[PDB]
Amino acid sequence: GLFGAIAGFIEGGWQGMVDGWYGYHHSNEQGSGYAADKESTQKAIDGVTNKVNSIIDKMNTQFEAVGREFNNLERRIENLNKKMEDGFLDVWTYNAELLVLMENERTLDFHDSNVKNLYDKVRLQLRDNAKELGNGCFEFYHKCDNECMESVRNGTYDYPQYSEEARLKREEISSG
Amino acid sequence: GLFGAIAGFIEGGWQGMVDGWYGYHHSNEQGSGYAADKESTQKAIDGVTNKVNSIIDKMNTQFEAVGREFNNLERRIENLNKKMEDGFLDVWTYNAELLVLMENERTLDFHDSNVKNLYDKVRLQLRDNAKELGNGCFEFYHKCDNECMESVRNGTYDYPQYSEEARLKREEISSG
Amino acid sequence: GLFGAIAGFIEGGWQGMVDGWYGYHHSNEQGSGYAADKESTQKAIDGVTNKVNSIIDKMNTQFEAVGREFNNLERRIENLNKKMEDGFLDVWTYNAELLVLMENERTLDFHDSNVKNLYDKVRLQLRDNAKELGNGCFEFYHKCDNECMESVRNGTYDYPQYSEEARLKREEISSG
Amino acid sequence: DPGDQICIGYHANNSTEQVDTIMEKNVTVTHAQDILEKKHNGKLCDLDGVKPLILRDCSVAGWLLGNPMCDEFINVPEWSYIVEKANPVNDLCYPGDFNDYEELKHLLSRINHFEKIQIIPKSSWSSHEASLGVSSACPYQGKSSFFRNVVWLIKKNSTYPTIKRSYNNTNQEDLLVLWGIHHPNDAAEQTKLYQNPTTYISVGTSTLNQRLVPRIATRSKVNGQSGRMEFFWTILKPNDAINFESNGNFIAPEYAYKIVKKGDSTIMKSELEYGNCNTKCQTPMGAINSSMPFHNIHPLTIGECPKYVKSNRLVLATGLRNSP
Amino acid sequence: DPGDQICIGYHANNSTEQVDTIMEKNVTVTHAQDILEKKHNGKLCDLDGVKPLILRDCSVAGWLLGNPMCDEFINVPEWSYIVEKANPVNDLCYPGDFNDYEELKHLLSRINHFEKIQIIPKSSWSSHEASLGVSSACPYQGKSSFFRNVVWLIKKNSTYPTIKRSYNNTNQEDLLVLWGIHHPNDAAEQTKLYQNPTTYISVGTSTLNQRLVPRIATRSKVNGQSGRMEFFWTILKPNDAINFESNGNFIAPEYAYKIVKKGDSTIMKSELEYGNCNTKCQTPMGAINSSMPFHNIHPLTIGECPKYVKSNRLVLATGLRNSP
Amino acid sequence: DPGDQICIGYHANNSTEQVDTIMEKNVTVTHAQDILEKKHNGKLCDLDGVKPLILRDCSVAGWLLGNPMCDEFINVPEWSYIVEKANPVNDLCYPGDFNDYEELKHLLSRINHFEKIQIIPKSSWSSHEASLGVSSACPYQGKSSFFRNVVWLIKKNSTYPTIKRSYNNTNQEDLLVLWGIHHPNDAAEQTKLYQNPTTYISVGTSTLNQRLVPRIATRSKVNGQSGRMEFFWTILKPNDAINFESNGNFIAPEYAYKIVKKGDSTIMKSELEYGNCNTKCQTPMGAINSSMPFHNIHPLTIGECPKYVKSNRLVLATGLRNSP
Numbered sequence A, B, C: 001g002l003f004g005a006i007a008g009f010i011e012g013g014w015q016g017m018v019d020g021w022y023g024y025h026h027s028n029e030q031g032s033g034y035a036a037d038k039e040s041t042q043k044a045i046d047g048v049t050n051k052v053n054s055i056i057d058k059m060n061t062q063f064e065a066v067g068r069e070f071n072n073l074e075r076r077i078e079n080l081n082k083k084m085e086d087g088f089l090d091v092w093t094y095n096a097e098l099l100v101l102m103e104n105e106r107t108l109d110f111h112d113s114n115v116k117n118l119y120d121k122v123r124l125q126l127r128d129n130a131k132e133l134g135n136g137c138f139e140f141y142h143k144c145d146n147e148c149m150e151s152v153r154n155g156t157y158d159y160p161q162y163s164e165e166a167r168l169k170r171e172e173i174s175s176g
Numbered sequence D, E, F: 001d002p003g004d005q006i007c008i009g010y011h012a013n014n015s016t017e018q019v020d021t022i023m024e025k026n027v028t029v030t031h032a033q034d035i036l037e038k039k040h041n042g043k044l045c046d047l048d049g050v051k052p053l054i055l056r057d058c059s060v061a062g063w064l065l066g067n068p069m070c071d072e073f074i075n076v077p078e079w080s081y082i083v084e085k086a087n088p089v090n091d092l093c094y095p096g097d098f099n100d101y102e103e104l105k106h107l108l109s110r111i112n113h114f115e116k117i118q119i120i121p122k123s124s125w126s127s128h129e130a131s132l133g134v135s136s137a138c139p140y141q142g143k144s145s146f147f148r149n150v151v152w153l154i155k156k157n158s159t160y161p162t163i164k165r166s167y168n169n170t171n172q173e174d175l176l177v178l179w180g181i182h183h184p185n186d187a188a189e190q191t192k193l194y195q196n197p198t199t200y201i202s203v204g205t206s207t208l209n210q211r212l213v214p215r216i217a218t219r220s221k222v223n224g225q226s227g228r229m230e231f232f233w234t235i236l237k238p239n240d241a242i243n244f245e246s247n248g249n250f251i252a253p254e255y256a257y258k259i260v261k262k263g264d265s266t267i268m269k270s271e272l273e274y275g276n277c278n279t280k281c282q283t284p285m286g287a288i289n290s291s292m293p294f295h296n297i298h299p300l301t302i303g304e305c306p307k308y309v310k311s312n313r314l315v316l317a318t319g320l321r322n323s324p
């Protein structure tokens, strides 16, 4: 993908996350589980809904072929009528098919972008209070209970609250 | 946005930066202020200027409707004339409207990309000589005066010059 | 570029890498050299091949002008015939030219994306076992021989195998 | 000891829906929306409750002139659209040509109902034979007949007095008026039927200024006849009158058509017949009942219809790339 | 102690300009460029200094034939474009039809100036009455008159000698030549006016081979007349001659039109009149003075114009997403 | 001590190929694919082995009627396409008009081969002079002649008996049949050539019902002649017959054209002649031999051709931005 997240550094999808397009898997002392990120999922739903409606509404005023008849000595204008109507049908078929191809590429890349941005949202929250394992996961240098996980998910993680405990774990690891 | 900078990890714009689209806010012992990044701003201006001119120039050779008259027993060819001219007007309206929608998406994402790349330009200059606060800002591990700020802005920051002072600050912090 | 790699944080191309679009330059005790990354190069070749064929095949069903003749008192329908045929030629010229402009932008950005993703692929493999110099290069905190370089190139680098040696080098450097 | 983890991921499912892009074909996605209608019921149906006029084996000309093999259509109710076969077998049973026929059919594209009315009764021809204009080329029930809406007039007592007749359109609606002229084989037939050697038919309205002359030629027998009938039409406006003068070869009006309802209609070429169904979108191959915005059934449609494309497949990705 | 900081950011302002995209509508941006012209001055104006021919209540036919209610147009200067109402009230004051009228108007689309010249003086008709061809259907100042550019010829002393006349186009320019034929009510009128029972009008050039015959029919009174006038035109090329022969029913030329300037022109349907303004782009609703590349005023324009679209709004983002 | 390094990079080369994008022009890339054909061999060539009919200085009418200056085309083999100059000098050597000429050329667009056959031998005219219908306007080798495929019939012993002739299309193929009528200058010439003052030509088939009358007018001399010839055509279907009757002014058929091969053809306007080459794609400016999908040579082509665009340049990037 253009943005390197989907089928990229996050190798595959989660069959176990059924209520959303993007989200989190957490693992702490209280247990483990999936939570869809509702905000990014909802922005994506709005985006794609607008895209489909825009595609249908732009194709609203397209050519409507009309039946016309000509006698045996009006062959020039019958042929003109035929190339005119077929010409417009070819134009609108091209527009429809191409718009679908281009917009499909953009939709797939849009999902990819959304996953990358959700990842970066967590990464820029946690900073050095967690270790980036390189596969979409972070390993916390401190204990992160369900309230802490929820704070990361909903964008209210408190880096200074844990920075001391995390710094102590980091120094412990970098000393051996 | 596709690139996660505008209204993303940089939460909002700067009403106080009036002379450019992208730039820097600095804060050091000599004071604080805004400076627009002229290079990235100028590339963006060139890009969008070319885009607008390209849109106008591609719409240069579009259909021009011509007045035609038919008598009471030429109703088939009058109708053909009507569907032909209306057909071309519908085609060119679709082209204009769609090209504007698609190019507007691309323009907004282009600005977003430019902000992300300006951020990464600074980040890859500073490396571990500064701390990434996660909101578009860097906190220097060393003193960075107006000449140092200017060196970061214009792409000539000297990482080895400050790497020792910065390393000493880092070790001081990671020791408590 | 949209993705900031080509002519971005990687300042220029490699005249010395002749067998591929993207790849690696390595430098270790066993010597130095260029290796094209065959997987990303091949995905790019497939992508662009499909794009060119799609462009040709979508232009398959375009208007074919037909010769028509009219006498001296059929000037209205001769003019109609002329504006009809010229109208379709203008439409298909616009489609061809625009599709080429838009797809050229996307192709250049596609290459840029591929370079960024190859970079991130290595970075997320190496993590803190190497230092990111900010110009597309990594400096290893441990010895990386030709088998190790090959393991980075083909996606099978073993971070835990070297994490101890690297940690010892890091601690040595951060102590002065 | 193993630290706590949080991971970012995306959805995968068992979906096998595929879409295409510029750079790649047959991309499996988690969700997609097909936007192309490809099916039809293969029947001719009512259009929002309004039945069509299905002419079966008759043509438009056979209908409006009153071909005796077309008595099914002597008075047809309001229609939504008209269905004509490619080569109806009941057309001009007496060979000839319909003047400006395609322009007339084009007017029919804008009409939903006719009220047939009598303008010149068959009995009011006192100087001319009105019940002798029959032919074996227009048979009815094994006996010679003719177009029911027009009257083939013949000489009476070896004389054909100058016909001077006029009709004033007192109706509040426009009137379609039909008549014709007979081109016989040779001078012997001309004298046989109309006495007068040189004849004409002058027709005039507020706008029409017509004078037809019977052309004589030796022609091939068509449905057993070498003479020809050339038919004509006009639209008599309200409070206007049409005037006929003729000393022979005159196929006079008897019935004319009152255009009671104008609207959106079409003439549809199809070999299908009535299907006893209802639809809001009709093609010559069958009716469409669909919420999708596009269809590829047939370009000529009527009703509330999807937009036609020549595509075999239009599928929009809505979800994301589905990993195996 | 708080370290020094450098931050990357982007511009925001107080702008409320909005644009649309595929995925989102009404996106406030810091900068935008409207590219759609939506206003016009609602007036008919000169086109780069050149005034239009505004025919007011006259039609093209009324102008070129010389309807006496159209003396305003006896000699019109060079025009940029022509403006005709939808249903001009001064057309064929004597009822009839103009032959190949739409093709003639089409030629007018390619002409900017006429020089009217006299080809057959009204006095040179010695065997025929030239000053009696007047009607009450073509009144002027309360007295009967006729089209000023053509001469309605009448019998003289109960005789109508064979007219044989020719005009040689000595001018270096093409010439528009107009004439006509009179279709009377009945034989009594034919004899009354032209004596000769059967008449004709043969017209010939290097390319024309015409022979018209007066058709007689009983028609509705239009502007008080049941006779009809059928008018004809041709383009006599330089160094070519036109020849007329006729023994009655002949509406002879008097004035013909020299095509002095060909160029780009059009016939514009509009009920507006002259506005005493100047413009480089004109529509039938009003003139456009605009630097924007598109407009939605009216598809039929003339001059240096933006490209027409049916859009209500075309706005390009130039700046970036404006945060609240 | 300097640690080991691995770097990510991209390809650069010495390429100067440039492409355009929406936001930037003249972007040097490492690889590109030109998709626009811009060259042609400037010659008229065979189309997949099949030579064209190149009419040189003759027109379609001059060919099919048998202009004596067009003996090169008395029997032309099967053609792929036809090439006609803009203003061929050998057209109607005797001035006149070809009826429905453009519709006939349109039929020619669908024909690849004619077999000329004799339908009415020149000798079988016993009551009429068949070898006297010659003119100096149609010279051959310095002597007066005429169109070779039609017979100008003249009175015999100051008498012109009623011609009644018929031809039955026994061939299994459709037949193009040509004839004509002569419009003389005045009554003296009419009597001189055909005796009978008033004449006609009635033509009838299964569908045709024609009756032509010679129009008399004083016309300008064209190629030395003031009389005119009006020519006519029809398509006689297999097992149909055509019937002619006439008492003068009749240009009778002699040869008719059997349509042996229908297919894809065109009439190409060009001043070029035969180039002794072969091609699969032909334009009026020259032939195209190209694998590229687009071309800008000329919109009117025949054969297996690229798609025409009005572009001066279509170049697709395939590689990436090439750094200096």
Ligand SMILES: CC(=O)Nc1ccc2oc(-c3ccnc(C(=O)N4CCN([C@H](c5ccccc5)c5nnn(C)n5)CC4)c3)nc2c1
Residues within 6 Å of the ligand: A017, A018, A019, A020, A021, A038, A041, A042, A044, A045, A046, A048, A049, A050, A052, A053, D011, D031, D032, D033, D034, D035, D291, D292, D293, D318, D319
């Ligand atoms: C005539 C016509 O076809 N009109 C039309 C118009 C506009 C449309 O917009 C859409 C459309 C948009 C966006 N998404 C989905 C879609 O495919 N969805 C399936 C997945 N579903 C996810 C979803 C994701 C993963 C698992 C389960 C559900 C969801 N639902 N609710 N949430 C919070 N997330 C969202 C909707 C569908 N279809 C449209 C169809």
Ligand SMILES: CC(=O)Nc1ccc2oc(-c3ccnc(C(=O)N4CCN([C@H](c5ccccc5)c5nnn(C)n5)CC4)c3)nc2c1
Residues within 6 Å of the ligand: B017, B018, B019, B020, B021, B038, B041, B042, B044, B045, B046, B048, B049, B050, B052, B053, E011, E031, E032, E033, E034, E035, E291, E292, E293, E318, E319
């Ligand atoms: C008929 C027609 O409309 N033709 C046409 C053609 C091409 C155009 O290109 C543009 C166009 C391009 C790029 N940008 C802006 C634009 O909106 N600007 C406003 C902001 N301004 C910023 C700017 C940004 C933020 C604050 C203040 C100024 C600037 N100016 N100077 N610098 C260094 N930066 C740049 C120009 C505008 N308009 C165009 C209009």
Ligand SMILES: CC(=O)Nc1ccc2oc(-c3ccnc(C(=O)N4CCN([C@H](c5ccccc5)c5nnn(C)n5)CC4)c3)nc2c1
Residues within 6 Å of the ligand: C017, C018, C019, C020, C021, C038, C041, C042, C044, C045, C046, C048, C049, C050, C052, C053, F011, F031, F032, F033, F034, F035, F291, F292, F293, F318, F319
């Ligand atoms: C009528 C017509 O024109 N049809 C058509 C259709 C489809 C096409 O697809 C392409 C096309 C695709 C993708 N790439 C290249 C291209 O320009 N290449 C040159 C570079 N080359 C690189 C390459 C890159 C850098 C240096 C050397 C070679 C390569 N070759 N092999 N590998 C592993 N890498 C790839 C192919 C070219 N041309 C096409 C042309």
Ligand SMILES: *[C@@H]1O[C@H](CO)[C@@H](O[C@@H]2O[C@H](CO)[C@@H](O)[C@H](O)[C@H]2NC(C)=O)[C@H](O)[C@H]1NC(C)=O
Residues within 6 Å of the ligand: A146, A147, A148, A150, A151, A154, A156
């Ligand atoms: C985001 O998650 C945090 C949990 O970490 C929620 O914080 C709690 O908010 C309530 C008020 O609604 C307080 O009374 C609690 O004390 C908070 N708990 C902690 C641990 O801070 C927060 O509400 C969540 N936000 C949303 C929108 O759900």
Ligand SMILES: *[C@@H]1O[C@H](CO)[C@@H](O[C@@H]2O[C@H](CO)[C@@H](O)[C@H](O)[C@H]2NC(C)=O)[C@H](O)[C@H]1NC(C)=O
Residues within 6 Å of the ligand: B146, B147, B148, B150, B151, B154, B156
């Ligand atoms: C970029 O910023 C630096 C300031 O950090 C500028 O460096 C100075 O350059 C001048 C020459 O023009 C030297 O004489 C000074 O000694 C430099 N100062 C330092 C602290 O290095 C540099 O000129 C700036 N570049 C641009 C293009 O403005």
Ligand SMILES: *[C@@H]1O[C@H](CO)[C@@H](O[C@@H]2O[C@H](CO)[C@@H](O)[C@H](O)[C@H]2NC(C)=O)[C@H](O)[C@H]1NC(C)=O
Residues within 6 Å of the ligand: C146, C147, C148, C150, C151, C154, C156
């Ligand atoms: C990727 O590179 C590594 C070298 O680091 C290759 O690993 C070797 O694989 C073979 C089996 O094919 C083993 O027998 C060797 O012991 C491996 N060497 C090491 C150092 O691990 C690996 O094969 C490469 N993969 C590909 C596809 O080329």
Ligand SMILES: *[C@@H]1O[C@H](CO)[C@@H](O[C@@H]2O[C@H](CO)[C@@H](O)[C@H](O)[C@H]2NC(C)=O)[C@H](O)[C@H]1NC(C)=O
Residues within 6 Å of the ligand: D168, D169, D239, D240, D241, E220, E221
């Ligand atoms: C048809 O008959 C009506 C009356 O029976 C005629 O009505 C006149 O119409 C003309 C317009 O053509 C008006 O000027 C008169 O004022 C009407 N008179 C009346 C009493 O209504 C009508 O003229 C007749 N149609 C024709 C063609 O003569």
Ligand SMILES: *[C@@H]1O[C@H](CO)[C@@H](O[C@@H]2O[C@H](CO)[C@@H](O)[C@H](O)[C@H]2NC(C)=O)[C@H](O)[C@H]1NC(C)=O
Residues within 6 Å of the ligand: E168, E169, E239, E240, E241, F220, F221
């Ligand atoms: C109109 O008059 C001119 C001379 O007054 C005639 O001029 C001749 O034109 C013909 C071509 O039609 C030339 O062949 C002659 O050489 C010309 N002669 C002269 C003296 O100029 C012209 O023919 C006349 N037009 C017609 C139709 O007869």
Ligand SMILES: *[C@@H]1O[C@H](CO)[C@@H](O[C@@H]2O[C@H](CO)[C@@H](O)[C@H](O)[C@H]2NC(C)=O)[C@H](O)[C@H]1NC(C)=O
Residues within 6 Å of the ligand: D220, D221, F168, F169, F239, F240, F241
């Ligand atoms: C031409 O001649 C053939 C026989 O020489 C005629 O053939 C008949 O064609 C008609 C149809 O028009 C059939 O009904 C007959 O059965 C045919 N008879 C035979 C013996 O073949 C044909 O009619 C002639 N063409 C014309 C116009 O009379």
Ligand SMILES: *[C@@H]1O[C@H](CO)[C@@H](O)[C@H](O)[C@H]1NC(C)=O
Residues within 6 Å of the ligand: D025, D026
């Ligand atoms: C995509 O898959 C279909 C089968 O569903 C197949 O018929 C088609 O050929 C495939 N397209 C390509 C480009 O391989």
Ligand SMILES: *[C@@H]1O[C@H](CO)[C@@H](O)[C@H](O)[C@H]1NC(C)=O
Residues within 6 Å of the ligand: D289, D290
């Ligand atoms: C259209 O078809 C659906 C089945 O796909 C059916 O449920 C519905 O009733 C149909 N609509 C009408 C108006 O018959």
Ligand SMILES: *[C@@H]1O[C@H](CO)[C@@H](O)[C@H](O)[C@H]1NC(C)=O
Residues within 6 Å of the ligand: E025, E026
């Ligand atoms: C966008 O805003 C305008 C008001 O300026 C409003 O009329 C329109 O409905 C809005 N569009 C949508 C899709 O809400």
Ligand SMILES: *[C@@H]1O[C@H](CO)[C@@H](O)[C@H](O)[C@H]1NC(C)=O
Residues within 6 Å of the ligand: E289, E290
């Ligand atoms: C066009 O309008 C502008 C005002 O928008 C005015 O300043 C200008 O003078 C006008 N141009 C002409 C040629 O009248």
Ligand SMILES: *[C@@H]1O[C@H](CO)[C@@H](O)[C@H](O)[C@H]1NC(C)=O
Residues within 6 Å of the ligand: F025, F026
């Ligand atoms: C691009 O380069 C060509 C020369 O190859 C030049 O003629 C053209 O003007 C250039 N285009 C622009 C926009 O500068």
Ligand SMILES: *[C@@H]1O[C@H](CO)[C@@H](O)[C@H](O)[C@H]1NC(C)=O
Residues within 6 Å of the ligand: F289, F290
């Ligand atoms: C087409 O041109 C190429 C040279 O570009 C030549 O090699 C080839 O033989 C030509 N094809 C034919 C059929 O003449």
